[PDB]
């Protein structure tokens, strides 16, 4: 089986250097083509660099020309990329990918793909989140559903799971994607939609974990007056 | 009837050449071989008479 | 064809159980070069393999 196994991503402060591995598995990475290609937050893809095996036949896209570094792996087979001075610009998921352009006329497509990793330009820290419920209005009556929720504010970096009472209630649970505050620091909001009658007997417990930070928080949330 | 003539002409005249330089092999060596059947023909009419 | 092997892993197609008319492929001077050895390129449609 075909495995490319990212690794080496990571924060860097702009004009830093940073060196990614993708590890191959299962086939012969020696006679394959190997490619990076990134992918800016929200955007459209957008090719990096290929190396077609020869420590020199190596080629970059114009956006990336003389400020990132291709080079490949014996033995052990893995790949690497070296990102030199790099701009608030070149924030991507950076993904390697296959290829045997070399004979095959035929594949000349991206055969597998890996998964990618994470690659963030910034000067911003590492920093926990912060949790604060969402509190419903008690007179509410325009419908037999209230809506509730959990905002995990000022987290870095992804990801984030949630769960709810331990798993016993788990019934309308809807995650929100993250977003970007002009502060530097993301943002995310957990919700569930619920009857609103079992707002003041059922106790509402919304678990976030946070796997970089280790981070477990249980909050209830109470109906005002 | 498979090569044109400017060029099946250098193959015909090898094997020509092979061909003629064997027959006169064979000539030669049948006008040796007549010469010493005459030989013994001779030698028989001679026993005869 | 569209693309073609590369010289180092050139590709080879079989032919067999099918009728070759080479008059009008040769007959189209579309082509930079046509050597042929070992048989003319001419009168080839008068032969089989």
């Known amino acids: 089986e075909v495995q490319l196994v990212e690794s080496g991503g990571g924060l860097v402060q702009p004009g830093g250097s940073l060196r990614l591995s993708c590890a191959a598995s299962?086939?012969?990475?020696?006679?394959?083509?190997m490619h990076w290609v990134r992918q800016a937050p929200g955007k459209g893809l957008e090719w990096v660099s290929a190396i077609w095996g020869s420590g020199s036949n190596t080629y970059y896209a114009d956006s990336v020309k003389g400020r990132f570094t291709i080079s490949r792996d014996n033995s052990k087979n893995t790949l690497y990329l070296q990102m030199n001075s790099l701009r608030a610009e070149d924030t991507a998921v950076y993904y390697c990918a296959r290829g045997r352009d070399l004979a095959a006329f035929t594949k000349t497509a991206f055969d597998v793909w890996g998964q990618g990793t994470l690659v963030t330009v910034s000067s911003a820290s590492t920093k926990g989140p912060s949790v604060f419920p969402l509190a419903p209005s008690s007179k509410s009556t325009s419908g037999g559903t209230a809506a509730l929720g959990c905002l995990v504010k000022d987290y870095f970096p992804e990801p984030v799971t949630v769960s709810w009472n331990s798993g016993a209630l788990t019934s309308g649970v809807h995650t929100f994607p993250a977003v970007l505050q002009s502060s530097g620091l993301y943002s995310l909001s957990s919700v569930v939609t619920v009857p609103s009658s079992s707002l003041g007997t059922q106790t509402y417990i919304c678990n976030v974990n946070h796997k970089p930070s280790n981070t477990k928080v249980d909050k209830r949330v109470e109906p005002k007056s | 009837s498979r090569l044109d003539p400017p060029e099946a002409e250098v193959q015909i005249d090898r094997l020509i050449t092979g061909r003629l330089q064997s027959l006169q092999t064979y000539v030669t060596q049948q006008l040796i071989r007549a010469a010493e059947i005459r030989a013994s023909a001779n030698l028989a009419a001679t026993k005869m008479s | 064809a569209t693309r073609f092997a590369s010289v180092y892993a050139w590709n080879r197609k079989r032919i067999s159980n099918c009728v070759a008319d080479y008059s009008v492929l040769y007959n189209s001077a579309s082509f930079s070069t046509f050597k042929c050895y070992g048989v003319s390129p001419t009168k080839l449609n008068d032969l089989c393999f």
């Open positions: 299962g086939f012969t990475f020696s006679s394959y083509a």
